Design an enzyme around this catalytic site. Structure first.
Site, PDB file in Angstrom:
ATOM      1  N   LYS C  44       2.092   1.123   3.309  1.00  0.00           N
ATOM      2  CA  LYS C  44       2.745   2.390   3.651  1.00  0.00           C
ATOM      3  C   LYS C  44       4.180   2.229   4.166  1.00  0.00           C
ATOM      4  CE  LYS C  44      -0.526   5.239   2.399  1.00  0.00           C
ATOM      5  NZ  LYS C  44      -1.691   4.332   2.572  1.00  0.00           N
ATOM      6  N   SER C 266     -10.259  -1.334   2.394  1.00  0.00           N
ATOM      7  CA  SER C 266      -9.781  -0.904   1.079  1.00  0.00           C
ATOM      8  C   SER C 266      -9.406  -2.099   0.196  1.00  0.00           C
ATOM      9  CB  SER C 266      -8.589   0.053   1.211  1.00  0.00           C
ATOM     10  OG  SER C 266      -7.462  -0.621   1.766  1.00  0.00           O
TER      11      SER C 266
END
Lengths: 4, 300, 300, 4
Positions: C44, C266
Site C-alpha cells: 500500500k 494474504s
C-alpha cells in the site's frame, strides 16, 4: 535487562 | 534475471535518507541509514547470516548441529529467520521477562525457546546457554559479543554501503553500541580510507558503561549491554555520547511523526546524538551518517 | 551520492526471491515479490504516495487540505506514513473493531482516528467519511477503490520491476485482489508486452465475490472487499482461484518457517494459489511470479 | 469486515  | 536464491541474499544494502525536520539547530547535514529495510527489520540480519556463513565456511556446522544463542533482542530474531531459510534447528535462551509478542515472533520463524528465571536477567539466559552447550555437543553458539564475523560483515557490507552511497563524503558516523560490531566494522574501513572521518558511540545515560559508569536497567533496546563488548574496538571510537530514556523516546517519536520513519528506541537515541554533534559550529557543512538499527512496529 | 530526499523516494523497487521448500508438486518455478520491503511493510506504500502525488500534480491539495480515508487496513498505514513525510494532516475512519495495536501504529505516524460503530463494519466507516467530506471542504479523499493513480503506479513501478527482474521471462502473475490495483496495473503492461502472459486473481473462499458468490466475513486481510472494485479490470484477469482460511494460514506459516519469509495471511493465500497453478503439467518450466503483499509481524 |  539488555535486549541485544 | 535479478532473483535472490533465498531470503539471506537480500540482507543489507540498506538505503540512506536525509533528515529534514528532526534537525533543530543542525549546521551539518544528517542522513540516516535505514536498517529496518533488512528482511527481519533490524541490523542484526547482517550478523545472523554472517556468523552462520563464517561457521559454514570454517566447517563448524555438522549434520546434527543445533544453533543456540542467549538473546532477548533482535539477534534472536535474525538467527531465527536465517535458520528458517537455512533449514537449521534454532534454540534461543532468554529471561521469562521477554514479552509474549516477541515469543510469538520467534516461534513464527520456528525457533525453540528456553525461558530462564526472570529475576536472573541475561546472566541466567547466558548461564543456561553455557550449560546446554557443555552437556550437549550438538549446539553451535555464535557468541555475538565475541564473534569476529560480526564486525567483519560490517566492514564488507555496512561500511562499503556508507562509503559508496555518500561517494566518500561521509565525515562523521554516529551509532549506538550493543555488540559494538556496527561502529567497529565501519570505523575499521572508513577511518583507514579517510583518516579525517570521526566515529561517535552512543549508550544509555542510565547505563553509561563505556563512559566509565556502572550498569543499570534501561529501556533502550539493542544498546547498553552493561559491559565493554570484546568485539568493540574502543580505540577507533572518537567520542561517547550518553542519551537519556526520555530524549531517546521523544526523538524516536519525532522521527515517525515528522519524517515518516517508524523506528525503534535505539534509533531515537542515535539521532539524539547525531543532532547534538550536528549543532557544533566546527561541524558546519559536514556530512553525518546516523545508523537507525530497527523498525518501530516491534515496540507496541 | 545515493541519498533519498525523503522516505517516499524509497517506496517500491521490491526484490524477487525464488521459493525453495514451499513448492510441493510444482513443475513451474515460483518466485515471490516481497512487498514488505516497502518502508511501512506493505504494498500500500505504493498507492499511498501515488494517490497523493497525483493529487498534488492535479492541484487538488490546498494549504488547508486534510487527507481523509475510510480504512482499517494497510492503506491507512501507508497514508499515515506518507502524510508524516509530506507534513499533511491525516484523518482515518474505521470500525471500533480495529485492534488497539493497529490504532497505536497509525497514531505513531501522527494519524488521527475516527472510530465508527463496530456493528456497522466498513459501511459505517465509509458513511462517516462521506458525511465528513460533505460537511467540511478541507477534506481530500483518495478513494483507493476508484482512484486511477492506484493501478497507474502499478503500471509504472510494480509491472516494470517484475518485467526487468525476470528479464521478460515472466509467464504467470498470481495476486490477491483487494482494490485490484496490483494485478490490473501489472496485467495492463505485461499482457500488452507479452500477450502469452497470464494473470490469476485470488480471493477468499469465504467471500467469493469475483467468482459470482456473496460477501462473507473472513480473516484474509487485504483481500476480499465483498464487491467488484471499479479499479479492477476483470477482462485482463484470466482466472480466479478461491482460497480457504485454513490453507491461507497454513501456507503463510510455512513461508515463515520454511523460507524465512514472515508474511501476512494474504501472502499465504496468494501462495496457495501459485502452488496450485505450478502443479499443472501445461505449466512445466514456466516462471510464476506471486505477489506477497505484507509483513507477518503486524499479525501477532 | 474487510481490511484494505
Amino acid at each position: 535487562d539488555f535486549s541485544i | 534475471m535479478s532473483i535472490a536464491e533465498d531470503i539471506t541474499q537480500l540482507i543489507g544494502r540498506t538505503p540512506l535518507v536525509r533528515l529534514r525536520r528532526v534537525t533543530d539547530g543542525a549546521v551539518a547535514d544528517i542522513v540516516a541509514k535505514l536498517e529496518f529495510f533488512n528482511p527481519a527489520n533490524s541490523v542484526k540480519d547482517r550478523i545472523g547470516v554472517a556468523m552462520l556463513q563464517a561457521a559454514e565456511q570454517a566447517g563448524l556446522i555438522k549434520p546434527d548441529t543445533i544453533i543456540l544463542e542467549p538473546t532477548s533482542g533482535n539477534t534472536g530474531i535474525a538467527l531465527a529467520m536465517v535458520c528458517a531459510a537455512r533449514g537449521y534447528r534454532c534454540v534461543l535462551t532468554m529471561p521469562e521477562t521477554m514479552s509474549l509478542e516477541r515469543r510469538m515472533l520467534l516461534r513464527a520463524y520456528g525457533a525453540e525457546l528456553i525461558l530462564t528465571p526472570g529475576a536472573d536477567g541475561m546472566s541466567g539466559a547466558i548461564a543456561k546457554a553455557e550449560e546446554l552447550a557443555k552437556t550437549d555437543q550438538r549446539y553451535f553458539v555464535p557468541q555475538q559479543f565475541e564473534n569476529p564475523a560480526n564486525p567483519a560483515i560490517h566492514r564488507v557490507t555496512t561500511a562499503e554501503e556508507v562509503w559508496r552511497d555518500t561517494d566518500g563524503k561521509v565525515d562523521i558516523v554516529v551509532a549506538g553500541v550493543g555488540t559494538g560490531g556496527t561502529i567497529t566494522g565501519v570505523a575499521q574501513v572508513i577511518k583507514e580510507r579517510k583518516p579525517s572521518a570521526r566515529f561517535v558511540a552512543v549508550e544509555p545515560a542510565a547505563s553509561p558503561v563505556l563512559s566509565g559508569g556502572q550498569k543499570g536497567p534501561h529501556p533502550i533496546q539493542g544498546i547498553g549491554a552493561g559491559f565493554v563488548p570484546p568485539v568493540l574496538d574502543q580505540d577507533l571510537v572518537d567520542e561517547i555520547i550518553t542519551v537519556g530514556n526520555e530524549d531517546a523516546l521523544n526523538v524516536a517519536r519525532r522521527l515517525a511523526r515528522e519524517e515518516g520513519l517508524l523506528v525503534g528506541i535505539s534509533s531515537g537515541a542515535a539521532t539524539v546524538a547525531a543532532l547534538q554533534v550536528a549543532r557544533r559550529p566546527e561541524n558546519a557543512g559536514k556530512l553525518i551518517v546516523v545508523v537507525l538499527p530497527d523498525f518501530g512496529e516491534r515496540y507496541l
